[PDB]
């Protein structure tokens, strides 16, 4: 029972840790896309004068 | 690496090939590898414009472009705006510009003001030449320009044939023509003196005058000596058909 309680605690902590990291990762991913898009835009605005 | 090729996009214009030459004085410049990379490997008839700049010769350049199209000739100039560009673009002619990189400006995107030394849209190939110190001025590129012209006219060494014909067209719209004429005479190349510049008009006028009536006010003594040693042909016309006939003749036949 002591071992099972410790597993439940570790599973709770791991579930809490697993939520937030994914959210932060989504924001990091969210940048890079703007830079790629902005680089494509700048190249094409340059071609069009 | 003595040279580096680039793709050059003119603002609102055509894609050109731009080659930077880092040392114009490099012994045995590898023109064969350069021209292979540019796919300029056939022998081409060459029309070399001497002292080409912006001028009121519009219809004359239409005739020149027509003669070059019908002869598959490459036009070589100083990479600046001349007024030939609209006819070159429409006929898909090869226009090769050779200039010192420090003496020309890159065109600005959406510039309301064109610099007279801006690279002109219509050039298919640009050769920007430098020395090691990047101090090259106008006339110092002339040796490279003529060596390039001779190699373009020879084509690939494996084609056992005479080089294609080369004709020089002296416009003299710029004062820096003398070194290019000196080299053209040294290589036994025909030179057409075209009406429309003050220098060319003086040469044409004095060619028709008796020796006692010759007045030289703008032409240097060295150019007067070159006129006696070289193959000069006077064109006292701005007609598009007359220049076309002269260019077509000199690209097909050597009259000397």
UniProtKB/TrEMBL annotation, chain A:
Top-rank taxon: Eukaryota
Coiled coil: 2-34
Signal peptide: none
Protein name from the UniProt record: Uncharacterized protein
Organism: Tetrahymena thermophila (strain SB210)
Positions spanned in the full protein: 781 to 829 of 1754
Automatic annotation (TrEMBL), chain B:
Residues covered by the LSDAT prokaryote domain: 45-232
Protein name: Cation channel family protein
Taxonomic source organism: Tetrahymena thermophila (strain SB210)
Residues included from the entire protein: 91 to 346 of 346
């Amino acid at each position: 029972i002591l071992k099972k309680l410790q597993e439940i605690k570790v599973n709770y902590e791991n579930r809490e840790e697993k939520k937030k990291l994914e959210v932060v990762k989504q924001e990091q991913e969210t940048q890079k896309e703007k830079e790629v898009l902005r680089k494509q835009l700048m190249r094409r605005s340059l071609e069009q004068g | 690496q003595v040279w580096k090729p680039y793709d050059f996009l003119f603002p609102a214009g055509r894609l050109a090939k731009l080659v930077k030459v880092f040392d114009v004085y490099f012994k045995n410049f590898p023109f064969s590898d350069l021209l292979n990379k540019l796919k300029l490997t056939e022998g081409y008839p060459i029309v070399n414009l001497i002292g080409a700049a912006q001028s009121n010769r519009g219809k004359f350049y239409a005739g020149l472009a027509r003669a070059c199209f019908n002869s598959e000739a490459i036009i070589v100039d100083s990479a600046i705006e001349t007024g030939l560009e609209p006819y070159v673009i429409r006929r898909d002619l090869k226009l090769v510009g050779v200039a010192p990189e420090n003496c020309v400006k890159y065109p600005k995107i959406n510039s309301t003001y064109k610099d007279p030394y801006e690279l002109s849209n219509g050039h298919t190939h640009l050769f920007l030449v430098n020395d090691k110190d990047k101090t090259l001025q106008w006339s110092q590129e002339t040796l490279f320009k003529i060596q390039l012209i001779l190699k373009l006219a020879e084509g690939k060494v494996s084609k056992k044939g005479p080089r294609c014909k080369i004709v020089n067209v002296l416009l003299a719209d710029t004062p820096n023509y003398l070194d290019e004429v000196r080299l053209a005479v040294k290589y036994d190349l025909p030179i057409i003196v075209c009406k429309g510049s003050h220098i060319c008009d003086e040469i044409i006028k004095n060619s028709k005058a008796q020796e006692e009536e010759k007045q030289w006010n703008l032409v240097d003594d060295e150019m007067q000596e070159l006129l006696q040693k070289g193959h000069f042909y006077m064109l006292d016309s701005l007609d598009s058909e007359d220049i076309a006939q002269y260019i077509h003749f000199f690209l097909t036949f050597t009259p000397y």
